[PDB]
């Protein structure tokens, strides 16, 4: 049975508030589709439609990662005009961070996968079908956290929302 899977990395509840909270204050709602607070997430590698057989072997290489954890602190924001989006980011990610990304990119690659044809830009999106062009302010004080893990989602829609539900975790720093 085929399904959209995605390697994502995920915010920490009190972290996701404060954005929801920044998010309102400076964006009105004609200003495009805001991103519920349980699916802001940063993508590592969108994987695309999987059979089972390629979900368990994908789900094995990844298995074999073996990298330390590391921290993110967002301290950038900003739009997309082509994609029509409102993304939070960082000036300067990680090393950890991009290590953790391209080697799924890879495996995913490998693995027969379609991939991005763009460079990785690491982005947590806030509005979706933003067309118009709008003024982004900076993002809020100490929105700083340690990353422990990252996890395999399958992306679902169904009663007019998108659902992101977690098939499998793996911890970081082994
Ligand atoms: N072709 C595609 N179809 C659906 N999602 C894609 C995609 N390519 C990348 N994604 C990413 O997969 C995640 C879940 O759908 C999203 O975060 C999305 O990134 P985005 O937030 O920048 O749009
Ligand atoms: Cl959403």
Redesign the pocket.
């Known amino acids: 049975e085929p399904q959209?899977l995605?390697f994502?990395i995920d915010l920490p509840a009190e972290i996701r508030e404060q954005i929801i909270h920044w998010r309102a204050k400076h964006f009105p709602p004609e200003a495009g589709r805001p991103?519920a607070a349980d699916?802001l997430?940063?993508?590592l590698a969108?994987l695309?439609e999987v059979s089972a057989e390629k979900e368990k072997a994908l789900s094995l290489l990844a298995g074999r990662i073996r990298q330390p954890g590391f921290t993110l602190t967002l301290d950038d924001a900003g739009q997309?005009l082509r994609?029509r989006?409102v993304?939070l980011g960082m000036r300067q990610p990680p090393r950890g961070l991009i290590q953790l990304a391209n080697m799924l990119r890879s495996q995913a690659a490998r693995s027969g996968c379609?991939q991005?044809n763009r460079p990785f830009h690491p982005?947590?999106?806030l509005l979706?079908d933003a067309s118009e062009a709008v003024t982004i302010p900076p993002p809020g004080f100490n929105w700083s956290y340690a990353v422990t893990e990252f996890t395999l989602?399958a992306?679902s829609f169904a009663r007019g929302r998108?659902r992101?539900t977690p098939l499998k975790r793996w911890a970081l720093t082994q």
């Open positions: 959209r995605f994502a991103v699916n997430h940063l993508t969108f695309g997309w994609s989006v993304w379609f991005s982005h947590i999106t979706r989602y992306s998108t992101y």
